[PDB]
Amino acid sequence: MKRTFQPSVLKRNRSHGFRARMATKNGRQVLARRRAKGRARLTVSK
Amino acid sequence: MKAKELREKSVEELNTELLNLLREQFNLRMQAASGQLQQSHLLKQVRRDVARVKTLLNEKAGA
Amino acid sequence: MIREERLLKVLRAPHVSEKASTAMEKSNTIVLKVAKDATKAEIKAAVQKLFEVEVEVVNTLVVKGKVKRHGQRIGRRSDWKKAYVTLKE
Amino acid sequence: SRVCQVTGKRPVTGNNRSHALNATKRRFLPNLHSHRFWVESEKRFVTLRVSAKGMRVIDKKGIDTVLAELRARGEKY
Amino acid sequence: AAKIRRDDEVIVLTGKDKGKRGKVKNVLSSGKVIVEGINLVKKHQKPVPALNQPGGIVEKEAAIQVSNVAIFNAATGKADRVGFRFEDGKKVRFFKSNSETI
RNA sequence: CGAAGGUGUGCUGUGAGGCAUGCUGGAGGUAUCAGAAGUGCGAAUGCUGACAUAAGUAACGAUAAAGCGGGUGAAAAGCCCGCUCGCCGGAAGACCAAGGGUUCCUGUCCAACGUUAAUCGGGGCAGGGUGAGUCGACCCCUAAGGCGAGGCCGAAAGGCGUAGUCGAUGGGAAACAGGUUAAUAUUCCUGUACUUGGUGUUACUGCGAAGGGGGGACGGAGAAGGCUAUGUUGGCCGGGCG
RNA sequence: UAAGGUGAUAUGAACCGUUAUAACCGGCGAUUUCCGAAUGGGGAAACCCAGUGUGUUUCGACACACUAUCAUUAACUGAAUCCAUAGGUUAAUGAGGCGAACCGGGGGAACUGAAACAUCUAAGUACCCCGAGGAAAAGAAAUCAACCGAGAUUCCCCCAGUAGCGGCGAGCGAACGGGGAGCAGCCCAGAGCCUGAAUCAGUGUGUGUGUUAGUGGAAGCGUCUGGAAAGGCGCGCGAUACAGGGUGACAGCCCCGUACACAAAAAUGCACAUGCUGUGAGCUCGAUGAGUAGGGCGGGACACGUGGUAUCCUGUCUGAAUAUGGGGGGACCAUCCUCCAAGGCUAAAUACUCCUGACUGACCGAUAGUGAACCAGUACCGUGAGGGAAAGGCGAAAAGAAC
């Protein structure tokens, strides 16, 4: 069985990284909601 | 040190004092990493001295 | 200028180990912990002007911190830079 | 977007009403056309996206003052 | 702005050492002073062999609350409350019940 | 000279209840009459924590397989060493990419972890370890694609796209053999090299781009030849004659 | 202000102090790495790569500063194409991003109710987007009224679940008028007499009262139980202070406070008087907002669902008179009454609480109260959006158990 999560940091950073949220308006709304909740990891960047 | 004593000094004397303080800082931190300096506290005071000189090196140099 | 101030600030500590001692014997190479910025040219300039010794070549590596546990806190140690400074024969 | 430059007309909204009074959201669009007007002040042609009522305005009040209030409101021509 | 100071002599108003007097060694920011030879606790001093080790059961002085001590009057011999007056431009302490400066 | 709470006992009321007092506990409680309810639980395949039962039961994760001696230790079927036996060997060996992130190495510890014990460990703890002009990234160039000044379009948000600018999984300069650490090596060391730029005199001299031309620069299948990697044999060399 | 300190877990080490530049607290300053609107280009956030100019070169390189885009303005150029624009360069100013609710506008559901359901409801709600402010919106009658009159807007209580609207069902629901809170009016469409005219927007000068550190601040002893007195008993005192909190058990007189009386070098907030800069004031004469009012068709809002439907806004096609005139008074006509659209600005009464301080509670007390009293938006779960715990208590004092 091959599972659904086949990791890759390039596709991870291109799909859910900080600049991929900061490109669009809805990603900036995502970041505003993460800061309003107060989360430690804003995105998955490292 | 006496901050007023550094207020009575000039640009060149304060620059030579800054470079001498940084040299003494380097000697002390290499000695502290080497094993000596039972008296550690001088480290802190030397750091503060350099900061004070840089304050006047902005302040006497002009507003 | 502000050259020699940077030279005073780049060096941090000498390293003491088994590999450092074997280096200084078998290769006349000193091992020392530098700042994180620390280009090799300014490392060579600093050790030449402050330590009165001519320098052949400088290798640099980066030592990553170990993720230690204290009590229950996970804490990473600080990330520092090591330099093998080779002296002239 | 479908904005008349002279009159400021926008597409407005409303309902399709049926014969059984079903209401569906529709839009009313302005009668927009691009027309080029001969302005003899700067003595060339200026294209404007205007409504037909905007053309009637330019026929009533001359093009030279309508371009002046267009310059006043800060539009492009 | 501090009534019981370091080298003052005090009496104790409350405790196993009530009425007994002594001079204050040190003042701690927890609202507690140490008065030597007045509040003796018997600590079991554990030896930790990376030094020289006395060991044993050593009696030392514990912290007593500053509300429990009061400045000795040293004339009549009873406890006295102290306040602050401006005998001259430096603020100074003084005993109540007789206007005498400490 | 002992409150709430807890835990017994004795009384008492038609009942929900109440009063007394023993032990625990160690600082709160509250008459009477009024007032206000998050006011009374056994059930909702209720929710949360604790604890049972099955039950010391099934199981202990490839049917590649172990046996003995010595050591260490409080203790050895499992650790270390040694000798035999077995298993893989187009892998169950050796190098990497991705992905992990210190799991690597040494000393020390055996509570928890390890489906058993553990003196062992990928476990805890302290220290150590990653060395590059040539390897890779970064860098120069581009594909699919993305973003995209102006622009065009769209109630607003925004959509599409030009010039550009990113984008490798592709194209582009250069290093090998031997040795060395407990842990790194085409990185350190020895020997022998190579590449690209700047700078400075020297020899001649028309050079110069964002433009032109070439080159880079390319499919599948098949077949043959020449080689080499590599292996076998013989010679040679060192030991043996059981 | 200060005789004690070097933040906490958190000991230790080396020090710094005590009459004043130890430490602490406050006003103003300085420095402020990198990412982020991220602003020199790019990028997989916290990284890579530059260009230009100046000064420092021991010649291997350094150190600063500038270089985004858009809008507006201004200056140089500048095509097709004489002219000229388009375009290009440069400078100056301004904007951009974030933030809890309140506010205004552009779009805009469905579940649901109607005991089904399509008109209707839910509902202009949820939500999305744009924009601004400490409030915002409106706002000075082409308004109501009734032959009497009131005089801008907003908010609260009545009118009134009333007139009405409505598959006349489910439901929706005014106004006039009355009582209050708060009250404030103006200006351009244009000239002449005139220029510090009644005032407003900004700088300094001064005063008051604030805010940002602080200071002083009353009066209790013996005795019994008890580990410990603040408790019991007795005998006193203060109180413009018996709010509160600690103190070895319950303290007005032990402490910090409290009532009270005071305090600011420097920075601001609000009132003033004052002095510059812009700006008009006040009399006379005129003018008085045209693709507009209205109409036809299609929608929407008014409580009002096209109905006999007044009024308002509009996508579309038309289209006046212009104060001897025009709007409205709920189809419409005539007479009366009342106002003057097609241009603007405006305080207060009103809404809200991310945050700051103080005070309060017939609010909770650790399965409660915030998800979170404890290193909680944490561990952990998920590719992501996102979801999301459990966990308080020795003692008075560690005196935390030497041997």
Tokens 């806190």 correspond to: C73
Q: What is the sign, positive or negative, of the torsion defined by CA atoms of E38, E44, E50, E53? A: positive
Q: How far is the CA of D38 from the C1' of G127 (A)?
A: 48
B6 and B56 Cβ atoms separated by less than 8 Å: yes
Q: Does residue D72 approach strand G to less than 7 Å at its CB?
A: no
C40 and C34 Cβ atoms separated by less than 8 Å: no
- Chain C residues in contact with B57 by the CB 8 A cut-off are none
Distance CA E4, CA A39 (A): 49
Cβ–Cβ gap C50/B26 under 8 Å: yes
What H or E segment, with its residue span, contains residue E43?
A: strand E40-44
Q: How far is the CA of D64 from the C1' of G82 (A)?
A: 26
Q: Which of A17, A14, A24, A26 is CA-nearest to residue A46?
A: A17
DSSP-derived 3-state class of residue C12: strand
Report the domain count for chain A.
Answer: 1
8-state DSSP, E100: E
Q: What share of chain C is helix, strand, coil (3-state, %, to 5)?
A: 35, 40, 30
B29 reaches C (C-beta below 8 A): yes
Task: Give D56-64 contacts, CB < 8 A, sequence gap 24+.
Answer: D57/D6, D57/D7, D58/D6, D63/D37, D63/D38, D63/D39, D64/D39
Amino acid at the residue D44: R
Resolution of this deposited model, Å:
2.9
Q: Which residues contact C88 (CB under 8 A, 6 or more apart)?
A: C53, C54, C55, C56
Question: Which phi-psi region, left, alpha or beta, contains residue E77 (left: φ > 0; alpha: ψ -120 to 50)?
Answer: left
E22 and E38 Cβ atoms separated by less than 8 Å: yes
The DSSP code sequence of B7-41 is HSS-HHHHHHHHHHHHHHHHHHHHHHHHT--S--T
- Chain B residues in contact with C13 by the CB 8 A cut-off are 29-30, 33
Tell me whether residue D68 is exposed, middle or buried, using C-beta atoms within 10 angstroms of its C-beta: 0 to 12, 13 to 18, 19 or more: exposed
Distance CA C39, CA C45 (A): 10
E35 and E69 Cβ atoms separated by less than 8 Å: yes
Give residues 36 to 75 of C whose Cβ lies within 8 Å of B.
50
C4 reaches B (C-beta below 8 A): yes
Task: Enumerate the H helices of chain C as residue ranges.
Answer: 3-10, 18-26, 40-51
- The alpha carbon of residue C10 is apart from the nearest alpha carbon of chain B, in Å, by 10
Distance CA D15, CA D26 (A): 5
Distance CA D48, CA D6 (A): 8
B46 and B32 Cβ atoms separated by less than 8 Å: no
Question: Which phi-psi region, left, alpha or beta, contains residue E19 (left: φ > 0; alpha: ψ -120 to 50)?
Answer: left
D55 and D11 Cβ atoms separated by less than 8 Å: no
Terminal-residue alpha carbon distance, chain B: 23
**Angle value at C-alpha C67, between C63 and C72, nearest 5 degrees:** 160
Cβ–Cβ gap B19/C11 under 8 Å: no
For the record, the structure tokens of D38 come out as 């001969």
Amino acid at the residue E39: N
Tokens 């002046």 correspond to: D68
Number of residues in chain E: 102
Distance CA D74, CA D70 (A): 6
The DSSP code sequence of D10-57 is --EEEEEE-SS--EEEEEEPP-EEEEEEEETTTTEEEEEEEEHHHHHH
Q: Count other C-beta atoms under 10 Å from residue B2's C-beta.
A: 8
Distance CA C28, CA E92 (A): 69
CB pairs under 8 A between B and C: 20
Cβ–Cβ gap B23/C8 under 8 Å: yes
Domain with A37, as residue range(s), is: 1-46
Rg (CA), chain D: 16
Residues 20-59 of chain C with CB under 7 A from strand F are 20, 22-23, 27, 29, 31, 57, 59
Q: Which residues contact E74 (CB under 8 A, 6 or more apart)?
A: E9
DSSP-derived 3-state class of residue E56: coil
CATH code for the domain in which residue D4 is found: 2.30.170.40
Q: Count other C-beta atoms under 10 Å from residue B13's C-beta.
A: 11
Distance CA E79, CA E76 (A): 9
Q: Which residues contact D36 (CB under 8 A, 6 or more apart)?
A: D45, D46, D47, D48
What H or E segment, with its residue span, contains residue E49?
A: none
Report the domain count for chain D.
Answer: 1
Q: What is the sign, positive or negative, of the torsion defined by CA atoms of B9, B12, B18, B20? A: negative
E15 and E30 Cβ atoms separated by less than 8 Å: no
What H or E segment, with its residue span, contains residue C79?
A: none
Is the pair C, B in contact (3+ CB pairs within 8 Å)?
A: yes
Tell me whether residue D49 is exposed, middle or buried, using C-beta atoms within 10 angstroms of its C-beta: 0 to 12, 13 to 18, 19 or more: middle
- Chain B residues in contact with C50 by the CB 8 A cut-off are 26
CA distance readout (Å), C21 to B29, B32, C17, C30: 21, 20, 6, 8
Question: Which phi-psi region, left, alpha or beta, contains residue C84 (left: φ > 0; alpha: ψ -120 to 50)?
Answer: beta
For the record, the structure tokens of E56 come out as 């044993």
- Alpha carbon dihedral D33, D39, D44, D48, in 10-degree steps, equals -20
For the record, the structure tokens of C22 come out as 């074997």
Amino acid at the residue C8: L
E71 and E35 Cβ atoms separated by less than 8 Å: no
Distance CA E56, CA E62 (A): 18
The DSSP code sequence of A3-34 is -S----HHHHHHHHSHHHHHHSHHHHHHHHHH
